[PDB]
Every structure is written in C-alpha cells, then in structure tokens.
Design a binder for this molecule. Structure first.
Ligand SMILES: O=C(O)c1nccn1CCn1ccnn1
Ligand SMILES: [Zn+2]
Ligand SMILES: [Zn+2]
Length: 231
C-alpha cells in the first residue's frame, strides 16, 4: 500500500515500486503549520539512477539518498527538479555534494535564484515553450505550460506508462486549491489538456503530493482549479 502522511515522520523517506525500474519516493515536511507528504520519482537509467525532484529539504534528501543506496544500490547520477519550489529543489545542494549532477530548465533555475532557493547546476534546453518535449535518458520531460507554477514540468516514463505530474496534478482526495500563490489559474486547465493530449496512454499518474491514480487525476485537478476560480 502507498505510504500516507501519518506513516512517515518528518526526516524519513519511503520508496514505492511502481513498475520494473520505476519508484516513487515519498517524504513529509512542515509548511504553514501543517505536515504534508510529497512525491518524487526514481527511474533506472541503465546502470545509474535518474532522480526526479528532491525530497523537500536537505535532511529529507540525505535520507532519500540513504534509502536509495540501501534498497536499490545503484548510484544516483542525475536529478531533475520539475519547478523552483522547495519540495522540488530543496536538497539540491546535498545532491550536488553527494556527486549528483542536478538539472532544471533555465526558467526554473532563474526563479529559484530569485526566490532564494537552491539552484540546479545545469540548464535543460528545449523546454522554453508550452508543448515542448525532450528526452532525458529513460524519461521524457514535458513543459505543459503554466499551472501550479509558470515553470512546472511533467515527466513520463515510456517503458512503464508512468506519468509524474508534479504539483500541477492534485491527488483525488484533494478538493480545495489550497495555496496557489505562484499559480497561473487561468492557464492551468489549458496546461492540463496539453498533458492529456500528449500522454493519452498513461496508466500510472503520480501527483506532486499524495496517492497515485490514473488519468482521472487530470480531470479532477481541472475541476478543483476551476471551482477555486468561480468563487
Ligand atoms: O500545493 C503544493 O503543491 C505545495 N507544495 C508545497 C507546499 N504546498 C502547499 C501545501 N500542500 C502540500 C501538499 N498539498 N498542499
Ligand atoms: Zn510548487
Ligand atoms: Zn508542491
């Protein structure tokens, strides 16, 4: 069963096997007086591992590396952060110190610097316009346009039909927008349709936070976003 927020003390990290060679990682973190869970992705990249997103903080990200070594035992050689917030880049300096080459779009790198967050070393080219897709080892990186944030990316693992939606995709049980301080509410439904059109065969959809689902999470997220806009 997928680990839940109450089951993970802040500072620990769980790995969840989605498919052969694909894991989510789940951590927990305090934010404005409550503790939330957060998802990232791990994908076998030949004899190496590709990491999608930090574990939301330096201490969680160190635990993430320890759990990976304990349970998978292959070296994390590259990391992609899918937008500039701390659940995505917080921990990039621990990654860098551990030997991991860290990556993000130029937009994400810039926004991280402006926010005072940690900054991935390397710029990902080919993602500057909505609908852009690039291959990055065993995954496809896709920029659907502005949504949860203006820079947010999604990730697809073709070998397993795994779509990592990041914070642009809400879990089924989440019915309120919550904090959308950096969101483009007007563009968000448009961005989700680009995801739907580009990955119609996705079988596993992973939100940025919470329980995995299927393509229903896309329609679900548009419903939430639009309701927050009509009141
Ligand atoms: O909304 C987000 O994606 C987010 N990321 C970090 C903090 N937040 C807000 C609080 N939150 C987390 C999960 N659910 N709500
Ligand atoms: Zn965010
Ligand atoms: Zn988030």
């Amino acid at each position: 069963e997928y680990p839940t927020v109450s089951e993970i003390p802040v500072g620990e990290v769980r790995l969840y096997q989605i498919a052969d060679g694909v894991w989510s990682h789940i951590a927990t973190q305090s934010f404005d007086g409550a503790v939330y869970p957060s998802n990232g992705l791990i994908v076998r990249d030949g004899d190496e591992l590709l990491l999608i997103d930090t574990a939301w903080g330096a201490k969680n990200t160190a635990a993430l590396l320890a759990e990976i070594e304990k349970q998978i035992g292959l070296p994390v050689t590259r990391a992609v952060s899918t937008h500039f917030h701390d659940d995505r880049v917080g921990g990039v300096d621990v990654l860098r110190a551990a030997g991991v080459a860290t990556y993000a779009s130029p937009s994400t790198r810039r926004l991280a610097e402006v926010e005072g967050n940690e900054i991935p070393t390397h710029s990902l080219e080919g993602l500057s316009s909505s609908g852009d897709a690039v291959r990055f080892g065993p995954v496809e990186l896709f920029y659907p346009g502005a949504a949860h944030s203006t820079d947010n990316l999604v990730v697809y693992v073709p070998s397993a039909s795994v779509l990592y939606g990041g914070c642009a995709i809400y879990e089924l049980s989440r019915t309120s927008a919550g904090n959308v301080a950096d969101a483009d509410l007007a563009e968000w439904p448009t961005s989700i349709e680009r995801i739907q059109q580009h990955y119609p065969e996705a079988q596993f959809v992973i939100p940025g936070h919470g329980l995995p689902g299927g393509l229903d999470l896309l329609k679900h997220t548009t419903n939430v976003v639009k309701a927050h806009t009509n009141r």
